């Protein structure tokens, strides 16, 4: 009657340079990353993904805790996962793992400290660079749960990690959320676990009747639905990353600014509006064929940005216009509303904006979310 429900996941991508691992670099070094989960359980799986990697990658061992804050643990909490009963496990080119089922009290929002000890590992490497989340990485093989990381290096990205799921019953079920740096969480807080799904977690687990519903956020920074961008295109990735996901009840589509943000003229931009609202209904109709209920976000004000041209601005209205009356989308998150200045309708809110007038801040999150009808997530 229990079956896998995820609870966190983060969309993988090939590793940009820039995003690179400090020193000392992953190959023989010990990297501790940090979680926050929505729904709670007690029996837990973790995936980890090599999708985007041409080298076999090692995991000597792979323990999980609760994260104290910072890089700090309760040992007392630590367990060590196996894969086929062992502790190493090397993934192959282009694929992932998943690990035995383990057993481990997995509260609400329980922020998990997952520490891994690497061997050999690809410089072309599967990661999250926008983890939002302080990451800390130590030469050589610091797997005991009493390893001082108070001097790790730090690096605000993640990597390997893909996922977990727990076992649940019936009720419990998951929210898929596909979208770019805004869902994603550029201008949220770092180690803050604040991104509007955070948000929409949150209140999901405040409110009795949605208590057992959890959160995964796809978003990827930079990210586009139809070509360039950062990360594999939205429809490149929505097998993986979206219907390949256990438990998932409802998939919320809020992505496209940054294929309106890279045409260069008004025929451009008309074209790439089409294309969105045809990438929409392919999307709608894929996560229709597997029971999955799809509502569409607005895409939120550009003006005073470093997108905004008057030829983009109409591609953007065009785009909303189909979200909000074409009826396609099952429910309509209108966050263009939520998030729009309703003295200056074209531009983001001022106080809710990290001051790049694209990314909103904290409080733009929390307004985000605070918008969602959690109606629209029954069973
Ligand atoms: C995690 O993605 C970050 C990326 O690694 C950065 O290089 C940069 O990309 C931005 C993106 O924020 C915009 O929405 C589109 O234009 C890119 O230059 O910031 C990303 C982020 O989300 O933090």
């Known amino acids: 009657s229990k079956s896998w429900v995820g609870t966190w996941a983060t969309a993988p991508q090939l590793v940009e340079p820039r995003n690179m691992p400090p020193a000392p670099g992953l190959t023989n070094s010990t990297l501790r990353q940090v979680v926050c989960?929505?729904?709670?359980?007690?029996?837990?799986?973790?995936?980890?993904?090599?999708?985007?990697?041409?080298?076999?990658?090692?995991?000597?061992?792979?323990?999980?805790?609760?994260?104290?804050?910072?890089?700090?643990?309760?040992?007392?909490?630590?367990?060590?996962?196996?894969?086929?009963?062992?502790?190493?496990?090397?993934?192959?080119?282009?694929?992932?793992?998943?690990?035995?089922?383990?057993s481990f009290n997995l509260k609400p929002r329980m922020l998990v400290a997952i520490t891994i000890s690497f061997?050999?590992?690809?410089?072309?490497?599967?990661?999250?660079?926008?983890?939002?989340?302080?990451?800390?990485?130590?030469?050589?093989?610091?797997?005991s749960p009493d390893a001082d990381f108070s001097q790790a290096v730090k690096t605000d990205h993640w990597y390997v990690i893909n996922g977990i799921d727990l076992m649940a019953q019936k009720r419990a079920a998951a929210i898929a959320i596909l979208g770019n740096s805004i869902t994603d969480g550029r201008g949220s807080g770092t180690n803050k676990q604040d991104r509007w799904p955070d948000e929409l977690a949150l209140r999901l687990l405040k409110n009795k009747r949605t208590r057992?519903?959890?959160?995964?956020?796809?978003?990827?920074?930079?990210?586009?639905?139809?070509?360039?961008?950062?990360?594999?295109?939205?429809?490149?990735?929505?097998?993986?990353?979206?219907?390949?996901?256990?438990?998932?009840?409802?998939?919320?589509?809020?992505?496209?600014?940054?294929?309106?943000?890279?045409?260069?003229?008004?025929?451009?931009?008309?074209?790439?509006?089409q294309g969105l609202i045809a990438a929409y209904d392919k999307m709608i109709d894929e996560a229709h064929a597997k029971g999955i209920k799809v509502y569409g976000g607005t895409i939120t004000p550009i003006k005073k940005?470093?997108?905004?041209?008057?030829?983009?601005?109409?591609?953007?209205?065009?785009?909303?216009?189909?979200?909000?009356?074409?009826?396609?989308?099952?429910?309509?998150?209108?966050?263009?509303?939520?998030?729009?200045?309703?003295?200056?309708?074209?531009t983001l809110r001022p106080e809710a904006q990290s001051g790049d007038y694209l990314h909103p801040n904290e409080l733009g999150y929390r307004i985000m979310a605070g918008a969602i009808d959690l109606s629209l997530f029954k069973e």
């Open 37 to 102: 989960v929505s729904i709670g359980g007690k029996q837990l799986q973790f995936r980890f993904s090599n999708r985007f990697s041409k080298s076999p990658v090692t995991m000597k061992t792979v323990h999980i805790a609760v994260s104290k804050g910072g890089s700090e643990i309760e040992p007392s909490t630590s367990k060590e996962l196996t894969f086929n009963g062992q502790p190493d496990v090397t993934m192959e080119p282009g694929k992932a793992v998943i690990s035995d089922p383990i």
């Open 119 to 143: 061997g050999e590992t690809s410089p072309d490497v599967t990661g999250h660079p926008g983890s939002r989340t302080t990451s800390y990485l130590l030469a050589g093989d610091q797997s």
């Open 212 to 273: 057992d519903i959890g959160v995964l956020n796809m978003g990827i920074g930079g990210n586009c639905v139809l070509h360039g961008g950062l990360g594999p295109t939205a429809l490149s990735r929505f097998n993986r990353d979206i219907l390949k996901q256990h438990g998932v009840r409802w998939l919320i589509i809020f992505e496209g600014v940054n294929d309106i943000g890279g045409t260069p003229d008004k025929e451009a931009a008309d074209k790439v509006a």
């Open 305 to 346: 940005s470093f997108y905004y041209k008057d030829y983009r601005e109409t591609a953007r209205q065009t785009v909303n216009k189909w979200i909000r009356t074409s009826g396609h989308f099952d429910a309509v998150i209108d966050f263009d509303k939520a998030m729009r200045n309703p003295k200056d309708t074209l």
